[PDB]
Design a binder for this molecule. Structure first.
Ligand code: XYL
Ligand code: XYL
Lengths: 728, 303, 304
């Protein structure tokens, strides 16, 4: 039906915009799943064929795919897309690169200071991409079966700029992202530091005292033997044996974390395997029949069924019995294997499967293992260099990853290692982290790189605590988005061009992104101007009325406008009619919120669906009427904030309320904001006085702008312009 | 040399002079074709201004009023009138802001910060409009001088500056629309009153004469070579100058020594963006600060 | 030739294409029937309207099933086909490798408008004689992007007048016209004078053209063709012989504002040289920096 053969090729028209292309020397084509591809079942589509003696052409709504017979070459296999996004980059040639690809992601940010190259994704400004399937075939139950009989196997995506549908159909082909568990979406604490049981528990209790919520307790490699390992074994990098001086009763320690409602993960460095000094070695040496008198190591070999079984049952098994919830797979030792399968892919695939025996919807934490490895969340980007350049790369890196379906990157918030101390960098990084897929604080082995908020001065500490509480207020919104990724193939973090594919400005704001469906984020990733005592970012406001999510400062779209914020504030925006649910009790240890705040932005209708473990709740705003209903009844108490004011507090059940009488306006006003920006600025008092007096006295908006245009401080002009623009 | 001549024409006396160097002649044809033609145009303009200059001379001698006045003589209570050292009133009808700094080579234009008192002002040469009160950086090519007239200004010009006549046989009355106005031309042996009241222009004189009067109302010559005292209704006629934003924007981008990609983007975005405030927002993103201020002057005149 | 085109019905009938599926006649210059349809049914009607020759503007790569560069197939076959229209006809197309001088004229394409691009171009042009490609037509004043500078446009036109071909061209900007009256009176007049000079030089150029064709001598020669044993002949990259009677040293850098003059270091071979325009004399052999106003170009002739 949707399968055509010609010469030694097979073409499957999976959708009008997706064509599998195979070559076979043997006349046998591959039906089995691959490391990448999990499903080729798609509903029948319409297309046309022009088949001649020596040529075939397959025509869809969006592509002409041509094959002239013989071996696949740039001349024998090519395609024209039925778009005009470019004058002459509308042709795919087999084995050739074309321009327009919007990129995807890469294995890691290990040792990266700022930007690094990315792999291609499936999204292109010019409307097509090819995704080579170079992976091994799988058995029915998901084991490596060997080499595909399709010796060339490609997917041609020709979705134009319908990026969302491209990603949806990629997830249909490669398997949806599984559901995260709610616990993964809260704050994680991590540090490469030789904590004892006592010192780690004291820190967790200090987080509680300081009003910082946490969901995960990471224990880095100093949980296991390091310096005690005799040198004949090699290093202490790999370990499976508790340091009993630091953790004299591991099961008790983990029970203590469990009693604090924390999930626990240990660092695993797998590459040196199970050597003869290890606590599990006698059991593993028995199972794998090793020579114990010659201290024969169980060398790491994830190609080997018996090794994997010993690793899961006899090495992880006892640690999981002590209470370890999930595994931080920390692989930095290369891509070499006899099978030709990346050991990182084998670890992620097999550990993610094994993790589901411990807990429902369990996770791992591991580096990116290529297309399809979004099936094994979470992503771990690794050893970023602590720099402004690294932070400036990170928003772009994160949204761009959605172009290959890898939507759960966990970055070391505040960066991993080396680089330079700057409290303002640490605070900006946490701001981004809170509005990123996962908020995991982590640092390398320095005495000087703790991400503890109280490491910093009173201003930085308070702002960090505020943002860390905000992350937990956002867990309902994150969890709902998580269920949407798993069920409908929509990323939490989208580049602007997913929503605005035809706006040139949607390609010109690398670090700006949609965060779920209700929020638009423009993180500040550059050090402040000391003259203004504010940092800035150029923001593109799409057509419509926008508000600062925090302040209610208004912006009339469509405009590109430099926006300025103190180091303690982040640019996050919501449209007229936006509805955002918040946990009213972020510090309370509840499996699901007892109380939701409904934050409503006035000036249009809107709608929000809060998806939960065992409910759906619909919030509707239609002609000033706010209505909450749910699929199931519950004791939940709902609070409504309309623009500035709390309207209803702690109201139970379903309900409908008229907000047409109430104040739609936010307090945010030009005069107050002007005074604040002049007051903090490190500029002459004569300039502050003159600006305040003139902008108060001059009434016409165009003459207020003419007054600021004469200011010799170009950045002060831009800061004052933002206020006048918001105040027009 | 050209900027200095522009000032000299709008100064009490226009005397070209140089020291003994073989290289310092002020002869216009000492300079290239562009400079030569602009100098000749300004030198002809000086003779066109002689009626206005001679009248102000008789006013200095009879009423103790200077031809050239600091801004604070007319605006003693405005702080901006003390902050524009080189800006002045030139008789009663004209306000001059000479450019006295070398051009920005990236713009191919010089500039001066002009204070526009409350009122509607027009560039005397181009009719480019400005809504006072504002302080505004204005940009001109080296061949153009910032000289302004209010709505209702009336300036007499000798129609025949090259003809050797003890008094002009022909006067052009140049009228700036949008308000009432009055000019009294004092001469050796006459006084002529030009009045503009609810769109009625009337010329009278204490004595009759063979003088022929030309009238220019904003852009357009209405009456050529009309003798004797008369009245004409200008309410029917086009009040608007041709000056327009689109033409001026194209010229400023076209002369500028900037990237063609920047010229293309500015022309496209200022053509496409309809709302004035969003046109200003667009120019506020431009990395060239003086280019912003030049485009801002055009957007401010075009508001 | 796609289904919307005026010639499509005739081409679709000739090549047996499925018109209800809007099957294109895809570019295939390896294919005898495609070429015949291209020349007879696509170019043919346009030539009957009066088109004299074809500007082949190929920027789509070197892929063909034969392994032959499509640019080479286009230049070869279109040059041959052009001779049916007019005696000694031309094309205008990019260089297709050694031997493609048989298909004049060269078309260098989408240069960036810059002092850098001008400063490379005389060297590029004379160096091309070393593979026999003696008829490069550059976009005079540059093609695209880059920066406005009326002096750059004027220096570029001075060079073009003393280049194999003088073709004014620009990209799609409202701002990049090469019309002389785009510029101020001084620049406009100089441009008009240089454009007149190109036509004054056609007898010289046409005579040198017949010499290229009959005797294998380039119009534009690197200095080392005449002076192979003079080290200075390898050290003046933008200096060249322009036919047998003139030596050109184009100025390719912005003037020194203090002098109001541009300059180039000229090597004068042994003998007495004169500025072709002014008669200013120079005793060779010497290396001398020479200075010209933006309206004047260094071109020299020997006594006799
Ligand atoms: O186990 C120590 C490691 O260096 C970790 O701290 C890194 O985060 C791994 O990428
Ligand atoms: O047809 C438009 C092209 O861009 C031409 O203008 C170039 O000169 C080709 O190289």
């Amino acid at each position: 039906n949707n399968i055509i053969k010609f010469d030694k090729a097979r073409f499957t028209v999976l959708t009008e915009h997706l064509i599998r292309i195979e070559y076979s020397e043997t006349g046998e084509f591959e039906e089995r799943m691959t490391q990448m591809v999990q499903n080729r079942e798609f509903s029948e589509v319409n297309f046309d064929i022009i088949e001649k003696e020596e040529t075939i052409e397959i025509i869809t709504s969006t592509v002409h795919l041509y094959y002239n017979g013989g071996e696949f070459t740039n001349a024998s296999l090519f395609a024209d897309v039925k778009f005009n996004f470019s004058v002459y980059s509308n042709r795919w040639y087999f084995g050739e690169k074309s321009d327009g690809n919007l990129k995807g992601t890469t294995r890691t940010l290990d040792m990266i200071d700022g930007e690094c190259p990315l792999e291609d994704g499936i999204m292109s400004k010019n409307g097509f991409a090819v995704l080579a399937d170079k992976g091994k075939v799988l058995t029915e139950v998901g084991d490596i079966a060997g080499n595909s009989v399709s010796t060339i196997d490609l997917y041609l995506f020709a979705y134009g700029r319908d990026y969302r549908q491209a990603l949806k159909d990629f997830y249909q082909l490669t398997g949806n992202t599984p559901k995260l568990p709610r616990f993964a979406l809260g704050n994680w604490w991590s540090r490469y530091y030789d904590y004892s049981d006592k010192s780690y528990l004291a820190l967790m209790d200090k987080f509680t005292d300081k009003k910082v919520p946490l969901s995960v307790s990471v224990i880095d490699m100093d949980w296991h033997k390091v310096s005690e390992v005799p040198s004949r074994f090699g290093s202490g990098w790999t370990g499976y044996s508790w340091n009993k001086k630091l953790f004299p009763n591991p099961e008790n320690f983990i029970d203590e974390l469990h009693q604090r409602k924390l999930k626990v993960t240990l660092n695993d460095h797998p590459a040196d395997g199970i050597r003869a000094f290890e606590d599990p070695y006698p059991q593993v040496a028995q199972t794998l029949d090793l020579n114990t008198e010659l201290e024969e190591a169980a060398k790491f070999d994830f190609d080997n069924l018996k090794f994997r079984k010993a690793y899961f049952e006899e090495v992880h098994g006892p640690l999981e019995k002590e209470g370890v919830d999930f595994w931080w797979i920390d692989w930095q030792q290369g891509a070499i294997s006899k099978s030709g399968v990346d050991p990182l892919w084998l670890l992620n695939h097999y550990q993610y499967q094994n993790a589901q025996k411990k807990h429902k919807n369990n996770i791992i934490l591991s580096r990116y293992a290529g297309p399809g490895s979004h099936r094994y969340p979470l992503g771990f980007s690794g050893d970023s260099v602590i720099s402004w350049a690294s932070l400036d790369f990170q928003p772009y890196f994160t949204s761009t990853a959605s172009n290959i379906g890898y939507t759960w990157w966990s970055h070391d918030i505040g960066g991993h290692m080396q680089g330079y101390k700057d409290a303002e960098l640490s605070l900006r990084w946490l701001q981004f982290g809170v509005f990123s897929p996962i908020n995991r604080l982590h640092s390398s082995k320095s005495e000087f790189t703790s991400k503890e908020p109280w490491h910093f001065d009173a201003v930085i500490e308070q702002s960090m605590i505020d943002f860390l509480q905000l992350r937990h207020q956002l867990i309902p919104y994150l969890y709902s988005a998580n269920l949407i990724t798993a069920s409908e193939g929509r990323a939490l973090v989208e580049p602007l061009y997913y929503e605005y594919p035809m706006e040139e400005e949607a390609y010109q704001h690398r670090n700006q992104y949609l965060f779920g469906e209700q929020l638009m984020v423009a993180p500040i990733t550059e050090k402040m101007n000391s003259l203004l005592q504010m940092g800035s970012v150029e923001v593109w406001f799409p057509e419509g009325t926008w508000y600062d999510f925090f302040s209610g400062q208004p912006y009339d779209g469509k405009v590109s406008l430099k926006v300025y914020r103190e180091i303690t504030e982040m640019p996050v925006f919501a449209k007229a009619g936006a509805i955002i649910p918040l946990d009213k009790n972020p510090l309370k240890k509840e499996e699901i919120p007892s109380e939701i705040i409904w934050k409503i932005f006035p000036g249009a209708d809107g709608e929000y669906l809060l998806l939960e473990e065992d409910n759906e709740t619909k919030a509707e705003f239609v002609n000033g009427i706010f209505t909450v209903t749910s699929k199931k009844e519950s004791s939940r108490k709902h609070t409504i904030i309309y623009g500035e004011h709390e309207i209803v507090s702690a109201k139970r059940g379903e309900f409908s309320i008229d907000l047409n009488g109430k104040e739609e306006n936010f307090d945010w006003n030009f005069s107050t904001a002007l005074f604040r920006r002049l007051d903090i600025a490190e500029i002459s008092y004569e300039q502050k006085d003159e600006i305040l007096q003139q902008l108060s006295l001059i009434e016409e908006h165009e003459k207020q702008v003419a007054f600021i245009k004469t200011n010799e401080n170009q950045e002060l002009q831009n800061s004052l312009f933002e206020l006048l623009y918001s105040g027009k």
